[PDB]
Assembly symmetry: C2
Homo-oligomer: 247 residues x 2
């Protein structure tokens, strides 16, 4: 039972209603292929706008959330607010969150548990730093990140794991197909060993870090790479080519 | 001239479209008196929603923002986005941001400079912790915080300073009118010595920390208290009595 190809567009802290509305209009007019799940993650001010403007064939994700339903957390939003705006996903543990904003594995884990308990899907991000890879500890780093996520997932149906090497995010330096495949095969083996075969076979493991129209077909051909989390290229019409990476 | 009374309602991480729509209906129906400036700060996912539903008599604030126009900051929003959604204020340096989320004085100062350069007004928050008050270093703490803010303000026209002792936030332990007046009068003194008499006379210094319908008149009567930043009571019709505290 094949895993459905998944492409998420992470707009990060970019865009305004004019430019984002135009990007949405491109997506709305595009033919989304078969057995292809497309999700757009706008800046938090525009979750509602995006969902209002986007055709229902495209889902909306929050870029982050907090770990309780309501409370005294100025500047935060909860899973319940995201669902209330019609969004069905949240991106958790993104590299920027971990390494610019200091979010811990423990905090990420708490967010995952709360987001899933409230009925959102979670795109859960993992990945090593260039110095970690240099020191020979890629697998150790991503296995520990994955473990903390797994400790907070009861139902993997609603989760997608996104492997993004830190050194590949926004640098132009896409992981080669071999580099991505190697990690993704190891991560799926982790799921098989630590959760179940059924979970290892059914869970999408998507690659991000400088995915572009020029790199996407060869990456998407790798048997353990199930899709993409796309930053820069998601603000360009190139995103449609990445959506069609398997065509 | 005399400083215009200022009330900010910080909804924090509370509410959904139904409940906030009901609250907004209450505010739209309410009297907003003479020479009172009222601002509501919704959760980030609802800035757009709140601005669309609220009558122009009430301004909208974001609860936080980041320090550049656009960029690779998953989960953040910029002053440009805030202005694009029709909001005119941002709250910066809120206690929760500093003490739960680790935002430094340095970062807050950067945000202040950026938000003001982008044409937003800023509600710039300061306040000592319980341990700092107990140690007797309130003044040293709040002056240092004010200095960092002042170092990043070229024009105080669109700044409001909000003193919220941490020990009063959400605790029900409202500062007494004396306690608030004592701090406010020192802050205005700081502004006189360090910026100008004119800035001291014209700059609103608002109090926050368990402001309630029962406490607001006597606080608003104090000559250096120019209004309120309201948390818990901003989620209730009680907010209207606080808006009308000098009536």
């Amino acid at each position: 039972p094949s895993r459905k190809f998944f492409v998420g567009g992470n707009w990060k802290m970019n865009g305004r209603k004019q430019s984002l509305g135009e990007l949405i209009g491109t997506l709305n007019a595009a033919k989304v292929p078969a057995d292809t799940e497309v999700v757009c993650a706008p800046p938090t001010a525009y979750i509602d706008f995006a969902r209002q403007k986007l055709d229902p064939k495209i889902a909306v994700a929050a870029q982050n959330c907090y770990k309780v339903t309501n409370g005294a957390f100025t500047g935060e939003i909860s899973p319940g607010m995201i669902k209330d705006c019609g969004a069905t996903w949240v991106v958790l543990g993104h590299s920027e969150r971990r390494h610019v904003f200091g979010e811990s594995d423990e905090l990420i884990g708490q967010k995952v548990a709360h987001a899933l308990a409230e009925g959102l899907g979670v795109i859960a991000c993992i990945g090593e730093k260039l110095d970690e890879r240099e020191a020979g500890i890629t697998e150790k780093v991503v296995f520990e990140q994955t473990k903390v996520i797994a400790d907070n997932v009861k139902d993997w149906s609603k989760v997608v794991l996104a492997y993004e090497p830190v050194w590949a995010i926004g640098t132009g330096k896409t992981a080669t197909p071999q580099q991505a495949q190697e990690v993704h095969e190891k991560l799926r083996g982790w799921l098989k060993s630590n959760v179940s075969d059924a979970v290892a076979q059914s869970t999408r493991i998507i690659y991000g870090g400088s995915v572009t129209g020029a790199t996407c077909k060869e990456l998407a051909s790798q048997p353990d790479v199930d899709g993409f989390l796309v930053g820069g290229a998601s603000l360009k019409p190139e995103l449609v080519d990445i959506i069609n990476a398997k065509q």
